[PDB]
Design a protein around this ligand. Structure first.
Ligand code: 7RM
Ligand code: 7RM
Ligand code: 7RM
Lengths: 525, 599, 532
């Protein structure tokens, strides 16, 4: 009985349902919790012997790395896989296309299903190559930043991967953001180009995209050229002569293969700005990609035969890591949903899952609460038997929402993964592994590989030893996918994460841990 | 008895003469036609296991490749040796210089023999490095295009290899092209620099080079700097201050070694502009690794090139023949190549044979047009010279008539040499159909069997369906892409698809009609798409018509092609005036070039 | 044996290495005896490929392997070494040592005033270099650019050089005392895109004008886009031109403590070093990357007998080739600490050098004879106050060392317990040409002794232009074939390079120095050929 961790009292462990293992296509990646603890202990005690092999296994390198791990938190010089060279678009597209070009890669569900379509890895390579050829002709090169202002669809994925192909860093801006937000982000990154579309369609409603871009770009001198996709082909949308060019017109000029550009492990893969003044969280290439592939493989128990549906927007780190990189690195299909959970009806999510026999579903608790209110009747209409792993992202999931998730969507036949992580962490920090870790509803459970979790007493600034404790959550050493800096403001990076608790990474979240070692997220501090 | 292939009836196979194998420096690369077909079948069914090893054997890689072959014709995304890195100038120059820097590389015969000279691989390395150092100081870098407007001499080769050394793509413009032609090509490629010379010498007459470049460059804003070689050192030739600089003066500033720049297999090696059925010339883009492998492979096997051999390709670098078989093929194989600046007639019609005797050339590559001209005027001169060093004779650019084939064999070859009628296009990069020297017996006038990686096929033009069985005629196509296939048309990939890939989906469209006989030999009957080959030059009737219409006095114009005794085919122009023939001949001479003028 | 020509040699007894040298050396010597030395020397001359290939792979960390050890000839000025290889100098000087042991001292910085002294570890140096390189990379500096340095001898000069190298650019270091016109001429020749400097310098207790001379030059240097200024004195009266000048601390705060290095080809230029020139125009000596670095590490290891445990103190300025090779590259490639002295030998007193040596137990000391003569005049009394037992190798650079100065050096500084290395070399040679190896070659005072690996020395008669065979000879000193660290060109003027070194005596490298060789083969440098 915990006097501090009141959540832990009288909550029974929920073993993984049998139907999960029935539906699992192959042997599990981890046999039992003990094997997990052995691997975890190695990842903490021996990051070299643990991550080196996995990095070589899960990633295709243009040049081998000579040092797995370097740098410390206090000095803000963390680096992983030093000396290595690779290209993200190759690991997400090229190698899979060569293996089997006809395998589905992007299952695109549009706002209206009539406009839905599917791209194979061969298709994705050709589109990415063409956009990258357009960008290369425009002078985009390694070390540049390219802005993306697109909804959740194929063009957002293709834009990101083409920018990566050339070695540039993409900065994805949520399509709903105001013109002033676009202005601040583009000017901070000094983007040389922008990829967007004339208009968007969401929930049946047309949305202004190119209009807001124009209103922003009048104050963004760095943007030399804009690439506009005709999502709606509305003739009234205006293109500025000498700056705005059409996606289809330009991609028609260039061939379906373009050599990728090799980049160093620690060369920046992308900037992601977080909502005060916006700050650009910078993520390297090698460390971030490994974190995405590693978490996607083990936390969700993804197998080659599987199909993932991450109901998140690329404007959010969730979309980046688990809608694009994690899945495509592992070569599995990923579902890209442009619409709203309600349009045309609140059965939209389930309609898509049944349509594509999705094996994994990843959603935020906010949508779960909305669907609890309005779409309970619609859940029963659709066939969700293909699913076996259900994920929760972005906020604490209350046990009642946990039980609702388990009953109506999972049918108490699926594993539930409550994933705790930040934009800065790149990938999962604390999460219960699918098919390995029994669940405590509302608990993120054990930390993942490379994550040495700790609880600090805020007043003393001292780590709290032992279980049955509550405090601010910190990490004792840097992990592969940890953000390396804040764009052109490394002092802010240090002051925000490294300096507040020296020797630690400060999450900004308070949490508690019970006698079983499960971590309970108490929310922001 | 062929009911369709009338050419094949009553044609006896011509085995390679015994004297060929006597003169051959070593055992042949292929034993017999049977081994050739076994290797060919492997190249078709299993291109990875066939070309992968050859690529490692014949090319020196900075980074190893992970995939031999990728992409399809239907999608226009063909790629070979993916992930590999290499440099063309290293494979053509550096490695051979290290082996033996004193080995001859460029045997340069100038328009007048007094100006002739020879460069060793060490010499070529130093000159290439110096020019590349000049270009690198000017800001030329990987991904740029550099224009070349030079005659056929050492400086053209050096300019091309220097551009390649830096990872840039060279665009060679035939020295005869008009100022307007230079303008269009430079502006299409947006070249940052141009390499040319003050004046040229051809057939004993001085020609204006820097003059035409200046006239073009007034409308070429992308050209930041020009490198001018003192071919004649005429002081009256004017250099634009701040743009024009002298070859000798600038190269003197930089050292004789410059590190080569690594490039990906599919990074573009060069642009070559070809007149098409459009009215505007199109820049054919060729990759690096695939093109180089095709050049070395075809040069080695079809011509039976050995290290001891010397090749004489009587073609201009402005033509794909010069690129592949005057420069890259030979230098990749490390053999000397003869670079002839003059004409077959100057000073006398024994000029070619004089050169062959002078350097004991083992291989000779020429277009049938020159053979017909020398047959007309220079037949007597062959006997004065010693041509015994030759064993392989090549034909390029046009169908070779059996009568010219026999003339070639009898008077030049002395019925002691192999004859290789090579069929290929600028777009193919290297040979498509040709009889391998010492391997394939010849049917005069037939290119014979297709080469490695080339899965030739005849399509019924009317139905668009592949024709099974022999003794058939149809439009010639290729069923899968090959290493040296052109990858795009510069910044216009849609024209590339519409021209080659889309007309017969799943196939490569040659634009040629051809036949296949019972023995499998292919007979090229010429273009189907109204393109005319005059004296070895591909010309578009559309471009000539547009040039005719430019003249305000002409209201309508229509141009066609017909048989010509000397140039193979001639172009005849018909004009309608609203209310002068020499003026129109000069108008097209000014619009395209002296070569494209109508007969 | 009376030498008819080599009058210096008569009556000079070989001076064997003192016993205390071997007592103090932490490990077995790199070379057993002179006989082994001559075997290796002969191999380096006859078989440079089989000799330098292995050493190059041992001492340097390569991003891409090389396919040819040696290429080109002197007569054609196309020398190239380790062709096809790729590497980064800042990685070999900083990164690899930092990963091995980040807390090992790298830069032992002794400032003009000792209170301002500090020590940077290899980990510290990695972070500082990475941050400066991040500043420069954000400014657009990239491979193929040149960056000028106008700094005194302190950490910031080393860091600036290594950061420029990290990005693949070539650094051109300018002596801090040089006039504005000198800065102008050098910057414009190189067309430098950026400049790194400080507000003011402090030398011998007095403040010195640095930023002022830079500004006066930069009004005529249109290529310089941006300036990085370090607050050495933080004098508020110092003016920065807005839109060009930015502060070292302010900018480096923006960027992270690790930056990936940029790989460059062996023969890509590592640095330009301009030489003080008689007549009008200064000439920029260009040094490759692989060849120069190997020469630095090789000479530093063998001539001075540097071991990982050792500490080196090179009393030379980075504006001089001595600072480049043996204050920065040589020691840092070998991963040993190097002492960086900002002040003068006299301030606060003439015991400053010896104070530093005792403070950090420096094992190797490298100085020019000029300082030795000055200290002989004024600072003999201070030597006795300090403990120099840590020393075992004493070096002389830049001038002929008089036998009297040699004995003074050995007795008062070395206590007749150290080896003395009279190193002969030029900016163009990159590293030592003729020098007696510590603990291997017995010394004749005033003689540079035997040539070093890869140096095939020869004497030419100026009148006949013919090599002089046999010993007891005098002539102009030349080298018969190019060596790894030989200068490759003079920036954008290769004809001047040829006319100066290659063309006067074709097939030879012309040192511009006259020298003699005695019966034992020891070389005696007699000085420049003009003025003989
Ligand atoms: C992935 C993401 O959302 N990145 S984020 O940059 O948007 O940060 C979101 C913040 O919300 C909190 N949070 C996120 N996920 C959970 C979770 N599964 N359980 C409990 N709290 C959670 C925490 O405070 C995070 O830092
Ligand atoms: C290499 C070259 O000349 N490229 S090219 O781009 O100029 O095209 C020339 C065109 O001439 C025709 N052609 C070329 N070679 C032969 C040959 N051996 N036999 C019969 N016809 C031939 C065909 O029509 C070609 O396409
Ligand atoms: C390192 C350095 O000095 N670079 S430098 O370019 O400044 O050298 C210029 C000249 O210095 C002379 N010189 C150098 N060292 C000695 C020495 N130990 N004994 C006699 N003369 C020496 C030599 O004549 C050089 O050519």
């Amino acid at each position: 009985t915990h006097n501090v961790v009141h959540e832990a009292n009288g909550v029974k462990l929920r073993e993984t349902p049998k139907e999960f293992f029935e539906r699992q296509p192959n042997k599990g990646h981890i046999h039992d919790v003990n094997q997990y603890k052995q691997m975890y202990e190695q990842s903490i005690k021996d990051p070299q012997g643990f991550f080196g092999p996995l990095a070589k296994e899960l990633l295709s390198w243009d040049h081998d790395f000579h040092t797995v791990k370097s740098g410390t938190l206090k000095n803000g010089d963390a680096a992983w896989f030093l000396g290595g060279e690779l290209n993200a678009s190759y690991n997400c597209v090229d190698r899979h296309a060569f293996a089997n070009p006809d395998k589905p890669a992007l299952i695109c569900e549009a706002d209206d299903e009539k406009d839905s379509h599917i791209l194979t890895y061969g298709d994705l390579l050709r589109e990415v190559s063409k956009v990258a050829g357009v960008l290369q002709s425009w002078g985009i090169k390694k070390g540049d930043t390219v802005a993306v202002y697109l909804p959740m669809n194929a063009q957002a994925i293709i834009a990101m991967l083409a920018i990566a192909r050339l070695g540039a860093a993409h900065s994805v801006i949520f399509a709903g953001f105001s013109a002033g937000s676009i202005k601040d982000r583009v000017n901070d990154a000094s983007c040389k180009a922008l990829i967007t579309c004339d208009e968007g369609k969401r929930g049946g409603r047309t949305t202004n995209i190119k209009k807001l871009c124009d209103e922003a770009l009048v104050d963004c001198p760095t943007v030399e050229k804009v690439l506009v996709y005709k999502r709606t082909n509305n003739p009234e949308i205006h293109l500025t002569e000498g700056r705005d060019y059409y996606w289809d017109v330009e991609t028609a000029k260039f061939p379906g293969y373009l050599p990728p550009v090799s980049v160093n492990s620690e060369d920046p893969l992308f900037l992601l700005y977080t909502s005060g003044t916006p700050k650009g969280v910078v993520h390297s290439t090698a460390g971030y990609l490994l974190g995405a592939a590693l978490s996607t493989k083990y936390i969700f128990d993804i197998h080659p035969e599987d199909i993932l549906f991450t109901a998140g927007d690329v404007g959010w780190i969730t979309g980046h890591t688990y809608a694009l990189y994690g899945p495509l690195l592992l070569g599995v299909p990923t579902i890209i949903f442009e619409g709203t959970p309600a349009y045309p009806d609140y059965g939209r999510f389930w309609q898509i899952v049944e349509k594509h026999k999705a094996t994994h579903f990843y959603v935020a608790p906010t949508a779960l609460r909305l669907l609890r209110k309005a779409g309970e009747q619609e859940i029963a209409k659709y066939d969700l038997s293909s699913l076996r792993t259900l994920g929760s992202v972005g906020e604490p999931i209350s046990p009642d929402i946990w039980e609702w998730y388990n009953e109506f969507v999972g049918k108490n036949q699926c594993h539930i993964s409550d994933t705790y992580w930040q934009t800065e962490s790149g990938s999962h920090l604390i999460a219960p592994l699918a098919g390995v870790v029994p669940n405590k509803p509302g608990s993120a459970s054990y930390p993942f590989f490379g994550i040495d979790a700790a609880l600090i007493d805020p007043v003393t600034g001292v780590e709290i030893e032992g279980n049955d404790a509550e405090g601010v959550l910190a990490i004792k050493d840097h992990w592969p996918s940890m953000a390396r800096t804040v764009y052109k403001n490394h002092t802010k990076y240090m002051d925000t994460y490294m300096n507040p608790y020296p020797g630690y990474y400060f999450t900004g979240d308070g949490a508690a841990r019970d006698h079983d070692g499960y971590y309970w997220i108490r929310g922001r501090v």
